[PDB]
Design a protein around this ligand. Structure first.
Ligand SMILES: NC(=O)c1c[n+]([C@@H]2O[C@H](COP(=O)([O-])OP(=O)(O)OC[C@H]3O[C@@H](n4cnc5c(N)ncnc54)[C@H](O)[C@@H]3O)[C@@H](O)[C@H]2O)ccc1C(=O)c1ccncc1
Ligand SMILES: NC(=O)c1c[n+]([C@@H]2O[C@H](COP(=O)([O-])OP(=O)(O)OC[C@H]3O[C@@H](n4cnc5c(N)ncnc54)[C@H](O)[C@@H]3O)[C@@H](O)[C@H]2O)ccc1C(=O)c1ccncc1
Ligand SMILES: NC(=O)c1c[n+]([C@@H]2O[C@H](COP(=O)([O-])OP(=O)(O)OC[C@H]3O[C@@H](n4cnc5c(N)ncnc54)[C@H](O)[C@@H]3O)[C@@H](O)[C@H]2O)ccc1C(=O)c1ccncc1
Ligand SMILES: NC(=O)c1c[n+]([C@@H]2O[C@H](COP(=O)([O-])OP(=O)(O)OC[C@H]3O[C@@H](n4cnc5c(N)ncnc54)[C@H](O)[C@@H]3O)[C@@H](O)[C@H]2O)ccc1C(=O)c1ccncc1
Lengths: 268, 268, 268, 268
């Protein structure tokens, strides 16, 4: 086709039609991929959201903190894709940090229970998904997670940044595992995307200073980006994930591709 | 004196006389610092170990996973150092990863409960200690944590590497907090040191392949290091921590100083 | 088509049929691109080499140290591609370092005249080519240079590594310029490829220790690479350049994509 | 004493009393070091400037582009420090980029002759000085160069940033050489310092947009720096160089210490 013609790809992390995973899924479908989707807690909602995708995809429940969901995932996917068949692609687009780890709520006041939850979902689950899914991936396969660059501290994202640092680190280790399968594991570091949760935050859900910082981060991003950054458009990030899902970056693993407008390559 | 003449410095993480913190404490004492030590669970043992230090230091209990130890730490330190007095320096030299996160035990088989424990102790506690201690630190003060470079995946260290990635990320955030106090926060990335736990590992405590990898990592380190690396000597790392504790790196925060022989600057 | 269907792409740096640029050109042609090739000094040779490409491409002379070649390049390319037409893609695959900057010839003994020549060709020419070609590139266009990771020093590559460090730095600046055109500028950091010059070096052209180091670097690469590294195969690198030439990494500029088997993400 | 008590240290790069090298020299003298200074072209001027140093230091001429100055340097230094004696420390604080490589003068318009000059002086000379001086350095010795972080492109500094990227790369290679002598080689990445040339630039010497960018870079620096950044104060950078010159960072080579207020650890 079709960048992804005839690849079977699992895509997690659709929750709204503004989810980065929603766009990745749409772009993957436009590109010939046959999807299986996961979806966390509100599966009726996600089913309804994902009905709007160019094509039908079976939707499986996966709460990444649920050991049983992870244990059964894979059997459930091979059931969805047919017993002879394996996955070519896996998209991790899962993230969460309790808002204590995120606010104008001081960095220091996030209880470990909360940061731990955040890291479980946002970092450890990348290894979890890979563990569940590598047994049902084809050689030449590709696992992609969603990242943002946590190299430098920043306002507001707080423990979520730490979670991303941990994720990038996890990604290099899953690369080692994925490699024994002929599978690549990479992260896409996106710039900020006005996802519903993000709009809620710039809109003041987590306090005014958190919103103000974030708005500041967004403007600076587009300014630093040599090709600009449009936070209202997930598609350049969806496409980048698809590029990683494709056979066109075959020698790249344990790695991070920056779909951020080049902002991170630029101080000012 | 005395690099650290008249600085009050808290040093955590002494457990044996081969602890990096033991050397840091010794070097800090030789350098004029007045120490308060923390010590986790075996305080009789640590007291006996620390008796061998050039000078007396009060030893306080601090289990970094214990909220109450953290809540009372600070009052306990100002009690140890005298009500008029604040800390100039804090050494975090705390690390742990349950051995499921460390073995030939596959990376994928570490339960999150265990990696979470590891991250609590090895990463989050850096923010914990800083939160507890910044209220009782002087402007010009310095928080230093022990790191190793988690930029690239490696054999055996597994989730502990992820924990370090998370720590480095935490360190940049505590820098932001520490800065409001005039306090620096930095990490020292050491090369491998034949600490008791490390010797136990190269000796096969965590399986033979884990020991073999680790021994390999050690030899390659000294080979890559343009000035060599002696894993039996913590003192160049103790000295580096002291350099960070001193006023001689006054414009360095949120940062990592590599006391690793320059190995990380060298591919081969 | 065709990852690159209907893109006009200039590809420099073909000198043998084992040139990375040769493979990039072949892969680009297989992918629907219409090429213009440049070629430095031995144009009869290059023409004969490039005859073996899936398709015809006009071959233009470009000595990147020749101001006049650069001044006329662009007019010559629009002549080759037709007056209405612009470039969508530019491949810099040019490198050279006089062997004084490369040997067992001590790092210190390379005269500046030689390292300067190397940097002119290997780094500065990336800005040169971009300067010449950006006026005749389409929005959505892509400039790609060939890199190897110079983050850490290494044996044998010496001043060539410095040249790559300078190149990566140049690349971030050309990104800033390229961006005003809607053009991306990125580098591909390849692992070692047994190009004729490289085989000559491991074979002892530059002394035995240089060959031995290099062979060592190669073996370690494939070992560190979670998906392996085949130094006899440029195609995963050709494909990665094509991925950058494509519209599939639209939010990536000033950046470096590692087509190296993930080796750089791995210490050991 | 005296961080640097009884160390013989060569310090290059004094040109005004606002030179970073001037402060390094002053701080080194306050710290017990016995200096030899180099000085490029205006030696009467430099002698007069350096008379203001806490102590006398012999001033030697060293034009780093002059092969003969480099060939004779070392004999001239051992003459200045006495035949039995070697250097413990070498400070490279040399930089220059012709203003074509620096302006609102487009990045693309800097002729290679000029960038080459800049790199000769700003990067290659680090290897030059090390080559000249390592034969007359003691084991445990320390070479330190002045850097600024060229990881990300920035406005105005243009080719000078490329020069720094090349310098950092050179530094890792001189580490390899320096190591055979027991000598460390490290760079200090300073934040912006209102040196005479820098004030001239923010004041509009190189065009208004270059000044405006630079002023912007300065303000953002102090904002990002968790401990702030005072561009009018070189002393935290002088002290950091001294820390590297000292025995207190004995396991750090091929490395870069950021004396920048922690700004580089912080996105915003
Ligand atoms: N701006 C952004 O939206 C942004 C998003 N991402 C990543 O993109 C991925 C998708 O996020 P999104 O589309 O923004 O947000 P979303 O809320 O649409 O998706 C998050 C998904 O995670 C799912 N999830 C939460 N908990 C669980 C669980 N227990 N089990 C299974 N699934 C669960 C949830 O159902 C939802 O579908 C996440 O990893 C993000 O962190 C990465 C980077 C950025 C961008 O944050 C950014 C750029 C620069 N600095 C900071 C941030
Ligand atoms: N080789 C090493 O020994 C090494 C050690 N460090 C760090 O140095 C620090 C000190 O470790 P060490 O001296 O090796 O080991 P240690 O066992 O002497 O000290 C660890 C300390 O942590 C303490 N601790 C554990 N749990 C708790 C708790 N709940 N509350 C309070 N304290 C607790 C424990 O009591 C002990 O004192 C740790 O952060 C290490 O991770 C950092 C890097 C390296 C080196 O690992 C390295 C280099 C390159 N690649 C991998 C590793
Ligand atoms: N192994 C490799 O072959 C390798 C090659 N590259 C880059 O790939 C690009 C193509 O190199 P190649 O295919 O290996 O070698 P090649 O000799 O086939 O191509 C070099 C080209 O540069 C051209 N050239 C030289 N001087 C001029 C000039 N004045 N004007 C115009 N053109 C000129 C020359 O004609 C030739 O076509 C160069 O930038 C390389 O540096 C990048 C990385 C690696 C790999 O070096 C690597 C990986 C890890 N560590 C070290 C090295
Ligand atoms: N702001 C700054 O002043 C700054 C300065 N440095 C480095 O500090 C070092 C000293 O520079 P300075 O004190 O700013 O400037 P300066 O003009 O006082 O010193 C430069 C010295 O180089 C000497 N020099 C020039 N040509 C030659 C030659 N052929 N042979 C021998 N010596 C020669 C010259 O005599 C002068 O003494 C240089 O390497 C700088 O690049 C490094 C970083 C920064 C800072 O630029 C910075 C921070 C963030 N982004 C960008 C810049």
């Amino acid at each position: 086709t079709g960048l992804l013609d005839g690849k079977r790809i699992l895509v997690s992390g659709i929750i709204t039609d503004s989810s980065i995973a929603f766009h990745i899924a749409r772009v993957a479908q436009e590109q010939g991929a046959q999807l299986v989707l996961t979806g966390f807690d509100r599966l009726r909602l996600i089913q309804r959201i994902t009905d709007r995708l160019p094509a039908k995809a079976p939707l499986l429940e996966l709460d990444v903190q649920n050991e049983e969901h992870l244990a059964s995932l894979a059997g459930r996917v091979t059931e969805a894709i047919g017993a002879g068949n394996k996955l070519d692609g896996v998209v991790h687009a899962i993230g969460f940090m309790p808002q204590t780890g995120m606010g104008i709520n001081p960095f220091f006041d996030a209880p470990y229970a909360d940061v731990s939850k955040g890291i479980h979902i946002s970092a450890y689950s990348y290894a979890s998904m890979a563990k569940a899914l590598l047994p049902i991936m084809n050689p030449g396969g590709s696992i992609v997670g969603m990242d943002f660059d946590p190299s430098r501290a920043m306002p507001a994202y707080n423990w979520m940044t730490v979670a991303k640092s941990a994720l990038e680190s996890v990604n290099r280790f899953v690369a080692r595992e994925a490699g024994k399968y002929g599978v690549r594991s990479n992260l896409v570091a996106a710039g900020p995307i006005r996802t519903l949760a993000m709009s809620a935050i710039v809109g003041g859900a987590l306090g005014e200073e958190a919103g103000a910082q974030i708005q500041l981060l967004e403007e600076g991003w587009d300014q630093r980006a040599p090709i600009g950054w449009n936070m209202k458009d997930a598609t350049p990030v969806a496409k980048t994930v698809c590029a990683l899902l494709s056979d066109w970056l075959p020698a790249t693993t344990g790695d991070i591709i920056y779909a951020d407008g080049g902002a991170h390559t630029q101080l000012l």
